[PDB]
mmCIF file with all atom_site columns, C-alpha atoms in Angstrom:
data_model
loop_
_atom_site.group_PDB
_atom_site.id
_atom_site.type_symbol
_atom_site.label_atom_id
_atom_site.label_alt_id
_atom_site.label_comp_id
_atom_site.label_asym_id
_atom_site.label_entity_id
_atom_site.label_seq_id
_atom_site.pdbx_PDB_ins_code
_atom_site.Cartn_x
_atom_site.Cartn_y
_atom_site.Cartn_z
_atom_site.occupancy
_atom_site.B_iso_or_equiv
_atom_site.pdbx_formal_charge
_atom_site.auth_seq_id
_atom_site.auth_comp_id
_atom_site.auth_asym_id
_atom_site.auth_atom_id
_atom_site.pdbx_PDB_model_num
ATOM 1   C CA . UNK P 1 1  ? -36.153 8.820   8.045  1.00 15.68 ? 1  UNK P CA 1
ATOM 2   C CA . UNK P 1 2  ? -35.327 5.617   6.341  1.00 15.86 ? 2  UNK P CA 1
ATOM 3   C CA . UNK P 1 3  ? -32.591 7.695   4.625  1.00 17.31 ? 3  UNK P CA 1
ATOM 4   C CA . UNK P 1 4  ? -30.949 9.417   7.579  1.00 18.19 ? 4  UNK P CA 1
ATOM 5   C CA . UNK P 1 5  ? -31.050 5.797   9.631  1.00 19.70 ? 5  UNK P CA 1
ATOM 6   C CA . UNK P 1 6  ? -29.082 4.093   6.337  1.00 15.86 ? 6  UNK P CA 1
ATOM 7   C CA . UNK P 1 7  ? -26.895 7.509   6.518  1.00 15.11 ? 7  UNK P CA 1
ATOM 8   C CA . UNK P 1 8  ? -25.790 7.004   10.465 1.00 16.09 ? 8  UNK P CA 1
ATOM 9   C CA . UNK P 1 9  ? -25.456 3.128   10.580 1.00 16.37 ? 9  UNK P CA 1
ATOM 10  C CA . UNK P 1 10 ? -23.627 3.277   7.273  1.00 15.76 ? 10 UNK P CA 1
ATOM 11  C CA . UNK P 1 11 ? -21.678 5.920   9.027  1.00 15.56 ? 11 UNK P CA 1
ATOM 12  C CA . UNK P 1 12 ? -20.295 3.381   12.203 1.00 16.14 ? 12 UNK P CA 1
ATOM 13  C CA . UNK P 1 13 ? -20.081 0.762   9.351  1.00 18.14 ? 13 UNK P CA 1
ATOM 14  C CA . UNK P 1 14 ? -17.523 2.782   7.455  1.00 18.30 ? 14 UNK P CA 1
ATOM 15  C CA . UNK P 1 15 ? -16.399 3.881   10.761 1.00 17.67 ? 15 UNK P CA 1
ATOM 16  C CA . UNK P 1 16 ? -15.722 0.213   11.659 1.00 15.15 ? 16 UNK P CA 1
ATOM 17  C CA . UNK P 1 17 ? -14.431 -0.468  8.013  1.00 13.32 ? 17 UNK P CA 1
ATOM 18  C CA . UNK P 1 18 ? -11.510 2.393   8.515  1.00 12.58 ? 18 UNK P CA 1
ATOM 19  C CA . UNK P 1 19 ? -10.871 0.747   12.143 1.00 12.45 ? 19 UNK P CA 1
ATOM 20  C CA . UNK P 1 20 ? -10.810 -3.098  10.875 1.00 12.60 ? 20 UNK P CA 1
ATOM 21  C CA . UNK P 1 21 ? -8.352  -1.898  7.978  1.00 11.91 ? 21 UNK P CA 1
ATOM 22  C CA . UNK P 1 22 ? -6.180  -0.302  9.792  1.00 13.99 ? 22 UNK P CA 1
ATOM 23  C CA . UNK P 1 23 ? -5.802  -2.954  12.313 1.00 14.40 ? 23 UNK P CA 1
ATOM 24  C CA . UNK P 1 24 ? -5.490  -5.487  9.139  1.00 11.77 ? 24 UNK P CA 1
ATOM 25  C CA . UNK P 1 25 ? -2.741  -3.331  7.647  1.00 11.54 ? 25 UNK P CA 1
ATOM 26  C CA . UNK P 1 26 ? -0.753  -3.011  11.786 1.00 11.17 ? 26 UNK P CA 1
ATOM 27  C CA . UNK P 1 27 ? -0.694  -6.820  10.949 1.00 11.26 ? 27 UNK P CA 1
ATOM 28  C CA . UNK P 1 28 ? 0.537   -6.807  7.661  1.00 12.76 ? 28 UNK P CA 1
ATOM 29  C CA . UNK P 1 29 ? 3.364   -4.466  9.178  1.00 11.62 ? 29 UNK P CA 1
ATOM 30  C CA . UNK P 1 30 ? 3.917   -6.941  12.102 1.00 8.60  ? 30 UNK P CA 1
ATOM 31  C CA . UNK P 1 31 ? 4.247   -9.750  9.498  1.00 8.29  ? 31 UNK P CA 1
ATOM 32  C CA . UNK P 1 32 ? 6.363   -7.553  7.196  1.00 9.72  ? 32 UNK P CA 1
ATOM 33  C CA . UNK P 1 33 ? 8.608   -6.926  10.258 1.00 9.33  ? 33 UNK P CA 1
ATOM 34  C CA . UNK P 1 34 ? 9.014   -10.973 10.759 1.00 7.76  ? 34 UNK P CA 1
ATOM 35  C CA . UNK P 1 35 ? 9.720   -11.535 7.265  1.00 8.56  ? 35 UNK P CA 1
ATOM 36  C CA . UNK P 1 36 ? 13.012  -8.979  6.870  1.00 11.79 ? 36 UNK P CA 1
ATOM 37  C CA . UNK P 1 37 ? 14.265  -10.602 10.375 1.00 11.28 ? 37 UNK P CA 1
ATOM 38  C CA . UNK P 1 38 ? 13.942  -14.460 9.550  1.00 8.44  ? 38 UNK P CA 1
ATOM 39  C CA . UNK P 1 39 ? 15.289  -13.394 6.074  1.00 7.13  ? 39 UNK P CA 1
ATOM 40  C CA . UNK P 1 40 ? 18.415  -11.755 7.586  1.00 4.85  ? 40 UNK P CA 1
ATOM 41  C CA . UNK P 1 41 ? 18.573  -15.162 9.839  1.00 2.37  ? 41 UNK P CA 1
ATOM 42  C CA . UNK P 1 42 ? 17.717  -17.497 6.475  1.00 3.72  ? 42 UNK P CA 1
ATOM 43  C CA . UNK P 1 43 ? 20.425  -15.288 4.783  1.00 3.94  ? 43 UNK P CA 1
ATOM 44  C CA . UNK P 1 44 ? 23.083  -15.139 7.481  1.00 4.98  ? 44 UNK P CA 1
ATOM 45  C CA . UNK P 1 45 ? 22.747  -18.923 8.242  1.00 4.24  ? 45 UNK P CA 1
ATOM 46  C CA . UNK P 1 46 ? 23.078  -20.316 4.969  1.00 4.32  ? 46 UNK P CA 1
ATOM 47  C CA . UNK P 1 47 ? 26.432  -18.208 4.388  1.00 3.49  ? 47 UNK P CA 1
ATOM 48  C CA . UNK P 1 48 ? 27.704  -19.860 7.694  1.00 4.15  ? 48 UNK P CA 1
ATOM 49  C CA . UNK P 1 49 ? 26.458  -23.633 6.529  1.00 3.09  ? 49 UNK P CA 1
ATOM 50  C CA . UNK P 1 50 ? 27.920  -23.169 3.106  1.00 4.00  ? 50 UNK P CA 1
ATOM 51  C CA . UNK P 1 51 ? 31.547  -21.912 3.985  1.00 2.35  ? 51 UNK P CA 1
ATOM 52  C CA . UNK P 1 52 ? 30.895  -24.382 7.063  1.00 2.00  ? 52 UNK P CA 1
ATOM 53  C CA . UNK P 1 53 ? 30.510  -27.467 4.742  1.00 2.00  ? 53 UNK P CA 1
ATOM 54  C CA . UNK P 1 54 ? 33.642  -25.903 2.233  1.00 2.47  ? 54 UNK P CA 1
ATOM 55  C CA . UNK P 1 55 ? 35.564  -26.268 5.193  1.00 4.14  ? 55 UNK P CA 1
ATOM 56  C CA . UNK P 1 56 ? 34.508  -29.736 5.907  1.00 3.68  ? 56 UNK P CA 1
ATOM 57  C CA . UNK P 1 57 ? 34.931  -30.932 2.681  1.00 2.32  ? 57 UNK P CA 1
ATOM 58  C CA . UNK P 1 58 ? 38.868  -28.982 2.287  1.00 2.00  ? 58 UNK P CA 1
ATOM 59  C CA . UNK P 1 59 ? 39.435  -30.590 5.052  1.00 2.00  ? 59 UNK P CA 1
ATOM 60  C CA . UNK P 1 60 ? 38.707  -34.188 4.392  1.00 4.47  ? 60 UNK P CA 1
ATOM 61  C CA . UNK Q 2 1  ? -32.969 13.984  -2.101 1.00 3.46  ? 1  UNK Q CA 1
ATOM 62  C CA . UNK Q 2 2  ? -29.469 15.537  -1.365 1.00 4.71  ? 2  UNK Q CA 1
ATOM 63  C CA . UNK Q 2 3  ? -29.894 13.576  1.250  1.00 5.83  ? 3  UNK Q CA 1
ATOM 64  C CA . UNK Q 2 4  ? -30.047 10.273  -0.603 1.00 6.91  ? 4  UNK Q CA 1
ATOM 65  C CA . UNK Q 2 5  ? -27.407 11.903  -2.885 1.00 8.33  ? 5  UNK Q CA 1
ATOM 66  C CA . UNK Q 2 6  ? -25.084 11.606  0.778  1.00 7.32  ? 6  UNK Q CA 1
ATOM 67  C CA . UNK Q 2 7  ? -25.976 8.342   1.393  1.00 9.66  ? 7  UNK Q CA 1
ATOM 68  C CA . UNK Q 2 8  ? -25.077 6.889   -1.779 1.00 8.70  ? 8  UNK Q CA 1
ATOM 69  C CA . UNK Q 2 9  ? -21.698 8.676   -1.193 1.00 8.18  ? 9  UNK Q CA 1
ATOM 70  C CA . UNK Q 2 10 ? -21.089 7.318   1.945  1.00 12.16 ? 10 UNK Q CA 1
ATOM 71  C CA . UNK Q 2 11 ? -21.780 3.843   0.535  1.00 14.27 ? 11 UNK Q CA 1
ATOM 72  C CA . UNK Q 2 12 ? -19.785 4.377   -2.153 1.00 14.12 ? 12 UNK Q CA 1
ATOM 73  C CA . UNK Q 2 13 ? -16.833 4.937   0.426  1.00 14.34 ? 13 UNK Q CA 1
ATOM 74  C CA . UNK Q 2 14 ? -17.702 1.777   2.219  1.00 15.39 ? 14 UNK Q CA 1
ATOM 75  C CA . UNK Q 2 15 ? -17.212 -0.045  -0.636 1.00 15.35 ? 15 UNK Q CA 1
ATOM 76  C CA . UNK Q 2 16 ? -14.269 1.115   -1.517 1.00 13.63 ? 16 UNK Q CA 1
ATOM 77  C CA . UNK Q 2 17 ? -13.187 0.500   1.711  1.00 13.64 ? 17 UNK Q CA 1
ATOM 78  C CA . UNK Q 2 18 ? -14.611 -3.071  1.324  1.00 12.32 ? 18 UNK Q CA 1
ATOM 79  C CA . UNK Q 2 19 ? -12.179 -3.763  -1.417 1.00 12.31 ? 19 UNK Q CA 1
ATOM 80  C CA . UNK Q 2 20 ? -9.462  -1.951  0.330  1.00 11.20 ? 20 UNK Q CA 1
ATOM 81  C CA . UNK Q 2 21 ? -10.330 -4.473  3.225  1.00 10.10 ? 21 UNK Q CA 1
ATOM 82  C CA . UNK Q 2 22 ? -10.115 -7.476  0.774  1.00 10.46 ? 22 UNK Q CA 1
ATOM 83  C CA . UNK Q 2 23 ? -6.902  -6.719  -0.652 1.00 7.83  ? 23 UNK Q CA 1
ATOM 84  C CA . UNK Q 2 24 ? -5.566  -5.873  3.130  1.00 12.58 ? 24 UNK Q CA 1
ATOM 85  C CA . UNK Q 2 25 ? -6.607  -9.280  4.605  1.00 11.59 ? 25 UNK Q CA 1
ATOM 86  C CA . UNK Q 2 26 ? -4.890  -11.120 1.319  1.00 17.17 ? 26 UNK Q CA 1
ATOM 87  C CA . UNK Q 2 27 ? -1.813  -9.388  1.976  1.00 15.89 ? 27 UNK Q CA 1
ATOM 88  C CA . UNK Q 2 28 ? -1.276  -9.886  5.547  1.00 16.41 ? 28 UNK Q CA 1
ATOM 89  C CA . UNK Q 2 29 ? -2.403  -13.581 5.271  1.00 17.49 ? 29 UNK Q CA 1
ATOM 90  C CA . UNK Q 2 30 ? 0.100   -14.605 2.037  1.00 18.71 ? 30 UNK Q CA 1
ATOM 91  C CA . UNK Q 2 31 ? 2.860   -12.178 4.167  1.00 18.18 ? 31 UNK Q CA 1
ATOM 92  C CA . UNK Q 2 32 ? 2.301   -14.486 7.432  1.00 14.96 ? 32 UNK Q CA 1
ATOM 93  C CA . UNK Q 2 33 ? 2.728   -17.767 4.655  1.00 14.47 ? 33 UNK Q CA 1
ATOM 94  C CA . UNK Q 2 34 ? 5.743   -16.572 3.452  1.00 12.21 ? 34 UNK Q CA 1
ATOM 95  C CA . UNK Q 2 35 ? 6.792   -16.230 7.126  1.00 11.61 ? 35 UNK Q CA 1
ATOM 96  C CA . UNK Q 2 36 ? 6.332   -19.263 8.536  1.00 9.41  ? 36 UNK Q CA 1
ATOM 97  C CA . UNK Q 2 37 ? 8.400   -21.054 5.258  1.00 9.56  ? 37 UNK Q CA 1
ATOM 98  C CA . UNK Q 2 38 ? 11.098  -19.236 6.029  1.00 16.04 ? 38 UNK Q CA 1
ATOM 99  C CA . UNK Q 2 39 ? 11.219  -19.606 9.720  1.00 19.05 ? 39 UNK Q CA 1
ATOM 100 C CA . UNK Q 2 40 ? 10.793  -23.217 8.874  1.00 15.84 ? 40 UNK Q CA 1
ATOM 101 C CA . UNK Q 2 41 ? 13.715  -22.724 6.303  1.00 16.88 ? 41 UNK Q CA 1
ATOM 102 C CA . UNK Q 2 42 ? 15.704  -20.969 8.666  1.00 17.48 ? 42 UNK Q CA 1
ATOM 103 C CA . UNK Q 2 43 ? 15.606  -23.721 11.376 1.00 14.46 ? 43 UNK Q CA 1
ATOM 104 C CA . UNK Q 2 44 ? 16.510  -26.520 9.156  1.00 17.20 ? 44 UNK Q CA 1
ATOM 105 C CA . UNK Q 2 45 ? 19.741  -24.623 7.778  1.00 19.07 ? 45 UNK Q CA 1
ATOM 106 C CA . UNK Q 2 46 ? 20.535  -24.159 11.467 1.00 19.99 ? 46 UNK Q CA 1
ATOM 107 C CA . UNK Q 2 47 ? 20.645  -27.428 12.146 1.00 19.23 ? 47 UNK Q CA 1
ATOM 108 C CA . UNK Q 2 48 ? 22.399  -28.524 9.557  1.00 16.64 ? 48 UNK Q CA 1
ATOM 109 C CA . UNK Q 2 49 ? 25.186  -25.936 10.021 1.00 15.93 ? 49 UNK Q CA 1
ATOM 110 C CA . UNK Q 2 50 ? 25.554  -27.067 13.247 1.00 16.52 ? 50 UNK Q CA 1
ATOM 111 C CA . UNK Q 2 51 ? 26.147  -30.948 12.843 1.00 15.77 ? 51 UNK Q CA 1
ATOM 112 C CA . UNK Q 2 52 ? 27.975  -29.964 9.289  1.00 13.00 ? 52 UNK Q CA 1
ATOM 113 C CA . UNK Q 2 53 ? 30.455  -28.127 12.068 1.00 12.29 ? 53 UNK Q CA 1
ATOM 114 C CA . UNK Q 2 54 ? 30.655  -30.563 14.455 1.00 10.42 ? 54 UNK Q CA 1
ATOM 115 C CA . UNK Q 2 55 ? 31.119  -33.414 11.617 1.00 14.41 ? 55 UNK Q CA 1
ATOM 116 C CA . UNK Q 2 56 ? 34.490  -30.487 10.949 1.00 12.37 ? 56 UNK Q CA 1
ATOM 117 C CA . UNK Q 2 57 ? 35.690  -30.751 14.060 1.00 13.76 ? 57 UNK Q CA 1
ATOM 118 C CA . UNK Q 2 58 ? 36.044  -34.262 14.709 1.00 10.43 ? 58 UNK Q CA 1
ATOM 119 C CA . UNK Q 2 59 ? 37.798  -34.516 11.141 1.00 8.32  ? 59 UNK Q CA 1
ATOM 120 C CA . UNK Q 2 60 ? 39.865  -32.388 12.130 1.00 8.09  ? 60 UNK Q CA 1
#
């Protein structure tokens, strides 16, 4: 009986290993998902500041 | 017997889900890093587009 009982609880523990990785990888999408935006912003704003600061300069 | 031959199977899954777990939770946490630099990165830029703009207006 000692090996069915290690059989089930290892059962729900692989059970809750499948569950707690694919929560873990949900939030590794979720941060994936905040990196590609806030590098579009990064991006787009430091084109704007650059040609902003050309123009500043040009026009001094 | 077989039966132990099953539970060392289903351990065997477990820990490969263990690893798959470690390498999950590494990637998620370094992804979250890398977002919060370049919020941070993206904020600063911001505001110096802004007063680099505003700095262009008046000279102009």
């Amino acid at each position: 009986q000692l090996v069915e009982e290690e059989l089930d609880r290892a059962q729900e523990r692989l059970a809750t290993a499948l569950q707690k990785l694919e929560e873990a990888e949900k939030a590794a999408d979720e941060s994936e998902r905040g990196m590609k935006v806030i590098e579009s912003r990064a991006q787009k704003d430091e084109e704007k500041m650059e040609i902003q600061e050309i123009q500043l300069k040009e026009a001094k």
